[PDB]
UniProtKB/Swiss-Prot annotation, chain A:
It comes from Homo sapiens. Highly expressed in germinal center cells of the spleen, tonsil, and reactive lymph nodes, and in the proliferating basal layer of squamous epithelium of tonsil, esophagus, oropharynx, larynx and cervix. Expressed in cytotrophoblastic cells of the placenta and exocrine cells of the pancreas (at protein level). Highly expressed in testis, where expression is restricted to maturing spermatocytes. There is a cross-link at residue 146 (Glycyl lysine isopeptide (Lys-Gly) (interchain with G-Cter in ubiquitin)). Belongs to the Fanconi anemia protein FANCD2 family. This is Fanconi anemia group D2 protein. It comes from the Eukaryota. It is found in: Nucleus. Signal peptide: none annotated. Homodimer; cannot be ubiquitinated and does not bind DNA. Part of a FANCI-FANCD2 heterodimeric complex that binds and scans dsDNA for DNA damage. Interacts directly with FANCE and FANCI. Interacts with USP1 and MEN1. The ubiquitinated form specifically interacts with BRCA1 and BLM. Both the nonubiquitinated and the monoubiquitinated forms interact with BRCA2; this interaction is mediated by phosphorylated FANCG and the complex also includes XCCR3. The ubiquitinated form specifically interacts with MTMR15/FAN1 (via UBZ-type zinc finger), leading to recruit MTMR15/FAN1 to sites of DNA damage. Required for maintenance of chromosomal stability. Promotes accurate and efficient pairing of homologs during meiosis. Involved in the repair of DNA double-strand breaks, both by homologous recombination and single-strand annealing. The FANCI-FANCD2 complex binds and scans double-stranded DNA (dsDNA) for DNA damage; this complex stalls at DNA junctions between double-stranded DNA and single-stranded DNA. May participate in S phase and G2 phase checkpoint activation upon DNA damage. The chain holds residues 416 to 1244 of 1451 of the full protein.
UniProtKB/Swiss-Prot annotation, chain C:
Changing residue 63 to R: Abolishes HLTF-mediated polyubiquitination of PCNA. The modification (Microbial infection) ADP-ribosylthreonine is found at residue 66. Changing residue 72 to G: No effect on ADP-ribosylation. The chain holds residues 1 to 76 of 685 of the full protein. This is Ubiquitin. The modification ADP-ribosylglycine is found at residue 76. There is a cross-link at residue 76 (Glycyl lysine isopeptide (Gly-Lys) (interchain with K-? in acceptor proteins)). There is a cross-link at residues 6, 11, 27, 29, 33, 48, 63 (Glycyl lysine isopeptide (Lys-Gly) (interchain with G-Cter in ubiquitin)). Exists either covalently attached to another protein, or free (unanchored). When covalently bound, it is conjugated to target proteins via an isopeptide bond either as a monomer (monoubiquitin), a polymer linked via different Lys residues of the ubiquitin (polyubiquitin chains) or a linear polymer linked via the initiator Met of the ubiquitin (linear polyubiquitin chains). Changing residue 66 to A: Abolishes CteC-catalyzed ADP-ribosylation. Changing residue 75 to R/Q: No effect on ubiquitination by CRL2(KLHDC3) E3 ligase complex. Impairs ubiquitination by CRL2(KLHDC10) E3 ligase complex. Changing residue 9 to D: Impairs ubiquitination by CRL2(KLHDC3) E3 ligase complex.
Amino acid sequence: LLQSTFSVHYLVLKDMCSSILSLAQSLLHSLDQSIISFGSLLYKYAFKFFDTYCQQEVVGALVTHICSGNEAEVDTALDVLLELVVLNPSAMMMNAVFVKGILDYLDNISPQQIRKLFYVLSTLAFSKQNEASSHIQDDMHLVIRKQLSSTVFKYKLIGIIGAVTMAGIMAADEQCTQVTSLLQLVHSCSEQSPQASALYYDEFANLIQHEKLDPKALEWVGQTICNDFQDAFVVDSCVVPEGDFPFPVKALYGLEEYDTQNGIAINLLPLLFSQDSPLCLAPYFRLLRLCVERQHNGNLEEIDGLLDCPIFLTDLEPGEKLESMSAKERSFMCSLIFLTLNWFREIVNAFCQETSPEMKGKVLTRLKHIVELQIILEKYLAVTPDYVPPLGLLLHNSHAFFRELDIEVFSILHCGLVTKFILLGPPELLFLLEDLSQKLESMLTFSHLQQRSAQEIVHCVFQLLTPMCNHLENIHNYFQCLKVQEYHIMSSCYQRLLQIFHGLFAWSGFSQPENQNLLYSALHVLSSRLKQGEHSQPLEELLSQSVHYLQNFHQSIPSFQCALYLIRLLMVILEKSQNKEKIASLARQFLCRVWPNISNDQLHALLCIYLEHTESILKAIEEIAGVGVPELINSPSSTFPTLTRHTFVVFFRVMMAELEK
Amino acid sequence: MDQKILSLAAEKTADKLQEFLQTLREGDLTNLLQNQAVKGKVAGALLRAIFKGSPCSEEAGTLRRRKIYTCCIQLVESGDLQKEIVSEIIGLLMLEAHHFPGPLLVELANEFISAVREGSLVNGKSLELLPIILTVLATKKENLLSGEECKKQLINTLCSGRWDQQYVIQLTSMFKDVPLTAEEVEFVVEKALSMFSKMNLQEIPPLVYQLLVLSSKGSRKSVLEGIIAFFSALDKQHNEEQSPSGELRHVEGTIILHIVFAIKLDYELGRELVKHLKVGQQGDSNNNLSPFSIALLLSVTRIQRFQDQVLDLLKT
Amino acid sequence: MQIFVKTLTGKTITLEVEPSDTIENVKAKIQDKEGIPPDQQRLIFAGKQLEDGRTLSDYNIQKESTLHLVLRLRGG
């Protein structure tokens, strides 16, 4: 309607510029993104069709929304400015001083919106026909060199962000010298602060990864970055390092299938002790990796000796024999294992895409190294309570402090299990499934994940989950159909598998028809897990087949949480379609089992799943309230267990709430 | 005598420079005031040869470092030197304050607090060392009382004693760069609000500006309460004198404009201003507003986000 | 005639200006005697921000009046 209105009735509405923009301003202030869509499109069409004065008033209103409004308002107005500069740069070039006016308020804007603001300004500046209007081009160069020349970290952050995004947009022979000067100056001013240099490496890595830009500049920068990396950390593999250390410093965690009389080694611990530049190892390797992937089209034959190297480390592996000599050596050790795991995570991020089988064996050895150093680090944090290094309690360290893996690292997940007790191990699978669950939870209900769209992640997981985690599901059913710690691990892997299943199938882009084709292929994995041959079947037949496959896991389930996840998965599948008796019978079975404790919220959720789906709520309540009585008579624990003296409160609360409802 | 130190900082370190300090041993006051009088360039180059020549690993270098710091703090206050060489020597004192042990900085800070007690501070560039040292005291968590407790007693000695009336605003410019706790910013703003009475009026607005950039990292309610209550009291004095306008109304308008332009950069300050001057229950509105706070609100009405809330507050 | 200009660090500078001179002339005098760039300068008198195109006679600035100078650093 709005396109037809503003395309036909543009001469009539040209009177009422101010009323239209007042309505747009009143609509942008609210929630409900369908409203804010209309608030954006009103500005868009008003800029599209009206006169130059109304265009100036539109830009004024947008800068008013940015400089004043809240996060949704700033986001929407910046999206609108991006759409208008990509639509009409020549119209915005008349009003570009008003867009320059946002540089007064950089102390009020979030760093993501700083990225977006610098992007829109620097794509406005660097159109080819507007090189007669070079005033903005010199002015923003000036303000970047001004921002970078401050000692304060909050200004240096904005300077680094603006420098990287500006170099990225201007890098699509003298322009090569220009980006050379800019990158050299940001590298020179960002050299001294470690936190600034880390952010610089991260931003430059994100730029090289996300954007395809003019490979002559990449060819220029790669010879710089590779050489600075190979002289920065890489030393000779002589067994005695420099530095008077009170520690048996060795070259640990080699692969030992590589040639041990090689030159490439890593001077990590002497650099870390000479610090007290080693905190910038992982992002710099990410940068080098990305430059080589963009140059040689993913061929890492220049690097692939680097995952063979040991690391010059203290003998870490016992953290019990050196107990109660608590000192700064504990902080040294915990930060050492921290940097080791970050480096190993970046290696695993690097060489997961490669298809060579011995490289996959090396990456699996790196994963075993990751999980064993994770055990040593959690032991070190167990003995040393509060001395935590913040480098940009286990729940805190799990998500934010470590490096974030890619999505293609779960291409490891195609390899099968080798259970060590019955005869890719269990705990590395636990690690991978924990990571994938923690990603899907944040994405569908984490920086490099969020530049990928949720549709892209759901699309990519469909290949990357179902036909190789169904194998692990079958292996888990086989194991639990048949010493304590491996059971503890494999129970957690089973829980995480069902969690990832539920998080995938409960995705809220399946009401839309465009993703439903993907959903059909999803059912084509689940229906074809028992028997094939029935192809191009109706949707409800695939649903019945999938739930019939999913139902017979119920005897193998070793804990309450996996049962709850299974019933929520069955419910969120069966709602795509009588089945209330199925859900009720399953819930009743899981309420009736022994469960060798159980948190009250799990049992609350299972009881509200049971009572809403039964045939009669009233006779169900009368059933449980002729069981609530023989809990007192017989047991000093009932004939309907998980109804202890503790869990009576939860049973009562659910019964009262559900009777009232 | 300058040409026999430039050959000492060039070849090697500590083997020849450490004996030159103990052999001279007479005076470091006449040898720094008079070489600047002919050519000021020979002093900044001398400092990178004495300071590189006196590390903090040994004690006799540390005492010489304390001595050279004391005599260069005295000369930048005493001498009517050029602003260029002053900026250079303050720059070298900025670049060479990173690696100090505990007990020397507290004595240098004692000389600093002694200067804020009595001494004629014609240039506040001498107290520019006082920001950064309270940072480097805080990073040393070891008994010199730890660093933070010595920092607390230091700020207490600054706040408790009388503030030198000509340069009170200058000391307020020093707490902007130091990190403080909530109790520390609360103490420094209650001292800064206590010092409003014993001044001329027209230095109050930029000191208010020096408060607001401090108020961005601490308590804003105390600063706003003190400013509003103080100028409301002065308005009451002017009205009972009426029953003195052409400066008091001017300084009021200037302060209003300053804190509106500070609210323009810090919306948390604006939201706490709207909260503080709320009517709410009918008993607060018989003490809240004033002929100064109403003008302040009607100037806040210039800011686009605060147009609705402030006019709805004044209407109700 | 004589006026005072007080800045944020409490430094007070005496200016010899005629009321016929414009405001950017005063900013040029601050540039000469203090080195502060005129685009960063912002002048306040009696709670009024001075505009560039006016003079002292538009804002009723008489003898021994006090101006307030603040430094408007765009980004930092």
